[PDB]
């Protein structure tokens, strides 16, 4: 049994989460454009920039986020972005997409100048997330939880952030005992994946280092959320 407040919170979040769209201007490129590495990298750069917009729109609308210290709000976006991005792509790769999209998107990522060192962990993480057979509820809440991690670099008031995080952890723990009745592990299995998810903070840093020594260029929004 969820409380009446925890039912108000979860509606506030799945409303927030289901506005997350990738425009067709961009999805149509998966199938339409030529297959070359320059073109693949560019398709991903658009995809990234548009999603980073959508992520700041989601984060903005989290309960209590607006109340937070201004320098901390930034530390939260910058610390959480890589994780929130890889979690999203994991939802996308375990979801029914239009015909051919799953397959060709994969092929594009696989020929976009990303070393095999990092392609591998990427797709075995998507497999791993696939097996928890998650719901939109759980994607939304995990994403929300990841964003409001209080233990990122730079954060000045941890307690403030804890206070917004803990409510969401509560709702997710109670949802794991409801919709997965015969397994008390589901919730600690989820939190277990966040460890694997946290490795992409290194993989993605290398992905960029490598991209940059080959004179590739990113949008000014991506440059901001991903710098120093």
């Amino acid at each position: 049994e969820l409380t009446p407040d925890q039912q108000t919170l979860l509606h506030f979040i799945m409303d927030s989460y289901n506005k997350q769209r990738m425009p067709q201007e961009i999805t149509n490129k998966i199938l339409k454009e030529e297959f070359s590495a320059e073109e693949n990298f560019l398709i991903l750069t658009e995809m990234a920039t548009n999603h980073v917009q959508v992520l700041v729109e989601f984060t903005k609308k989290l309960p209590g986020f607006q109340t937070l210290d201004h320098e901390d709000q930034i530390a939260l976006l910058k610390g959480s972005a890589v994780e929130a991005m890889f979690l999203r792509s994991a939802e996308i790769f375990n979801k029914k997409l239009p015909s051919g999209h799953s397959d060709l998107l994969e092929e594009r990522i696989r020929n976009s100048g990303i070393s095999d060192e990092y392609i591998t962990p990427m797709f075995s993480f998507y497999k791993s997330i696939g097996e928890l057979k998650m719901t939109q509820e759980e994607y939304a809440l995990l994403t929300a939880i990841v964003i409001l991690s209080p233990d990122r670099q730079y954060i000045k008031d941890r307690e403030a952030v804890e206070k917004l995080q803990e409510p969401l952890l509560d709702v997710l723990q109670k949802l794991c005992k409801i919709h997965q009745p015969e397994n008390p592990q589901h919730f600690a299995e989820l939190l277990g994946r966040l460890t694997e998810l946290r490795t992409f903070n290194h993989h993605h840093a290398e992905m960029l280092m490598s991209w940059r020594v080959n004179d590739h260029k990113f949008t000014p929004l991506l440059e901001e959320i991903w710098d120093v």
């Binding site: 917009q53 700041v56 729109e57 903005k60 709000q73 930034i74 976006l77 910058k78 000014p220 929004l221 901001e224 959320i225 710098d227």
Partner: peptide, 12 residues
């Protein structure tokens, strides 16, 4: 100077 992030946060 993360102007774009500041901008996206304060908006509507």
């Amino acid at each position: 100077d993360h102007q774009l992030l500041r901008y996206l946060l304060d908006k509507d």
